[PDB]
Design an enzyme around this catalytic site. Structure first.
Site, PDB file in Angstrom:
ATOM      1  N   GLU A 157      14.889  24.333 -31.624  1.00 21.49           N
ATOM      2  CA  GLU A 157      14.989  24.643 -29.357  1.00 21.49           C
ATOM      3  C   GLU A 157      14.988  25.326 -29.194  1.00 21.49           C
ATOM      4  O   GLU A 157      15.493  25.466 -28.643  1.00 21.49           O
ATOM      5  CB  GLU A 157      15.626  22.968 -29.179  1.00 21.49           C
ATOM      6  CG  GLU A 157      15.823  21.963 -29.104  1.00 21.49           C
ATOM      7  CD  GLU A 157      17.102  20.658 -29.151  1.00 21.49           C
ATOM      8  OE1 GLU A 157      17.696  21.433 -28.369  1.00 21.49           O
ATOM      9  OE2 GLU A 157      16.910  19.592 -29.250  1.00 21.49           O
ATOM     10  N   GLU A 169      14.269  14.369 -34.297  1.00 25.65           N
ATOM     11  CA  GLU A 169      15.474  14.388 -33.414  1.00 25.65           C
ATOM     12  C   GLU A 169      14.959  13.397 -32.600  1.00 25.65           C
ATOM     13  O   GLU A 169      14.182  13.370 -31.344  1.00 25.65           O
ATOM     14  CB  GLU A 169      16.088  15.464 -32.796  1.00 25.65           C
ATOM     15  CG  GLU A 169      17.464  16.180 -33.430  1.00 25.65           C
ATOM     16  CD  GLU A 169      17.615  17.090 -32.223  1.00 25.65           C
ATOM     17  OE1 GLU A 169      17.844  18.323 -33.157  1.00 25.65           O
ATOM     18  OE2 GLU A 169      17.942  16.487 -31.469  1.00 25.65           O
TER      19      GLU A 169
END
Length: 453
Positions: free
Chosen positions: A163, A361
């Site tokens: 991320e 995720e």
């Protein structure tokens, strides 16, 4: 439609959120050690000094993964365990710990998937600029090749960064993540140094003929128009500005990782608005085109969508506001919207070159309570997972090369600046006794794997 034969059913964690032992065995201070040790950064003053104590309890945790039937397990390596100062001497106890974990995983037939950088930068590297300093590229490269070359025999899947959007904007623009910096121009510099760091590692793996798959993980948010939910006519300015706003979330990272440029519309707008110096914009474009190299897979963290509309009075860097559709929401305030997983995956397949995709995720935070007979009946988490599992299968039916799915999270853990107030695990963790309690979602996931593998 079935899931393909070797589909990686996994679960995922990150070192600072679960490992504790924040200063044992010569481990260096990270920017998150420093950040959670400052008053006012984390809800209720929580920190990751102890977390789930996975550093000491990893063996029992791996045995729960074997009981769960995981095909793979996604974790991150704490840079400060290997290089306490970011540069300098390697720390043998740090390598020893990941040696034992990786071998225990291989021993139990679980494919390790390793995120190399999951936000825990050595504080000694922050002290000379952190990610805003272009020498970070080489300090990260030396660290990444050390662990790839050490574990490449046992670990086939490597993720350079988790991320980048958060590392850059939440860490350096909003200041809500470590290092707590608040400067949009520093944030863009961070974006760039991450891309170059990612490129240098991927190239090293291909040039040296290292037989591993290397990817990067992006949190992606499909953006929808409130105007189209309302059935009004969409003006062209509204579509233009909503698409600019969604390029900051998604294309700003997908474009350089998958095509070798930054998004031109966004960069023009940022330069027009004095948010980004025009020379840096041209330089960044040049440097990314020179260094770009395609990765082996894309990792996608998906949790929810955004619904946006045009608004000239907005305080955001783009003239937009967010709307709140009716429906089910989590303790995060995130809309439960499984269709967005499917739309996003179709949007990736149709707008970027063919690449294997892993959902690295996906999960949901609910306010779990342990019952009298020591159960946790998280039927809302089970429903979340079941519906998103179904969108994933549907996307495979439509030609998306989806090869794995990693639930966030294997166990409750420290949710960054939310502290331990948000529980994402399929395994409940009593933070006072460190006991692991399998939630109902653990047995659902266990059964879902059994019958889709």
């Amino acid at each position: 439609m079935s899931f393909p034969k070797g589909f990686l059913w996994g679960a995922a964690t990150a070192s600072y959120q679960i490992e504790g032992a924040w200063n044992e065995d010569g481990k260096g201070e990270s920017i998150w050690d420093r950040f959670t040790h400052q008053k006012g950064n984390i809800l209720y003053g929580h920190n990751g000094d102890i977390a789930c104590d996975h550093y000491h309890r990893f063996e029992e945790d791996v045995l729960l993964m074997k009981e769960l039937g995981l095909k793979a397990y996604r974790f991150s390596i704490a840079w400060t365990r290997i290089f306490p100062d970011g540069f300098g001497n390697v720390n043998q106890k740090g390598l020893e710990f990941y040696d034992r974990l990786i071998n225990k995983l291989v021993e139990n037939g679980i494919e390790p998937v390793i995120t190399i950088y999951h936000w825990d930068l050595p504080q000694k590297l922050q002290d000379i600029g952190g990610w805003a300093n272009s020498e970070i590229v080489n300090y990260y490269f030396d660290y990444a090749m050390l662990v790839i070359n050490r574990y490449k025999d046992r670990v086939k899947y490597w993720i350079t960064f988790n991320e980048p959007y958060c590392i850059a904007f939440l860490g350096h623009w909003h200041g809500v993540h470590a290092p707590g910096i608040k400067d949009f121009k520093v944030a863009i510099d961070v974006v760039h140094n991450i891309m170059l760091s990612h490129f240098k590692v991927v190239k090293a793996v291909k040039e040296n003929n290292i037989d591993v798959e290397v990817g990067i993980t992006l949190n992606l948010t499909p953006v929808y128009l409130q105007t189209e939910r309302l059935g009004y006519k969409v003006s062209e300015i509204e579509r233009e500005m909503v698409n600019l706003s969604s390029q900051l979330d998604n294309e700003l990272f997908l474009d350089p990782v998958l095509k070798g440029n930054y998004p031109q519309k966004l960069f023009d707008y940022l330069v027009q608005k004095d948010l980004l110096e025009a020379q840096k914009a041209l330089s960044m474009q040049q440097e990314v085109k020179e260094n770009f190299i395609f990765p082996d897979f894309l990792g996608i963290n998906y949790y929810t969508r955004a619904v946006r509309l045009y608004d000239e009075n907005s305080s955001w860097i783009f003239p937009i506001r967010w709307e709140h559709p009716a429906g089910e929401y989590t303790e995060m305030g995130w809309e439960v919207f499984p269709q967005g997983l499917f739309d996003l995956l179709m949007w990736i397949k149709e707008n970027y070159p063919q690449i294997p995709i892993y959902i690295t995720e996906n999960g949901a935070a609910y306010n779990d309570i342990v019952t009298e007979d020591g159960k946790v009946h998280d039927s809302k988490r089970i429903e979340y997972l079941k519906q998103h599992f179904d969108q994933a299968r549907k996307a495979i039916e439509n030609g998306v090369d989806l090869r794995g799915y990693f639930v966030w999270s294997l166990m409750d853990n420290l949710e960054w600046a939310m502290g331990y107030t948000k529980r994402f695990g399929i395994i409940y963790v009593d933070y006072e006794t460190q006991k692991r309690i399998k939630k109902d979602s653990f047995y659902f996931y266990q059964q879902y794997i059994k019958e889709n593998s």
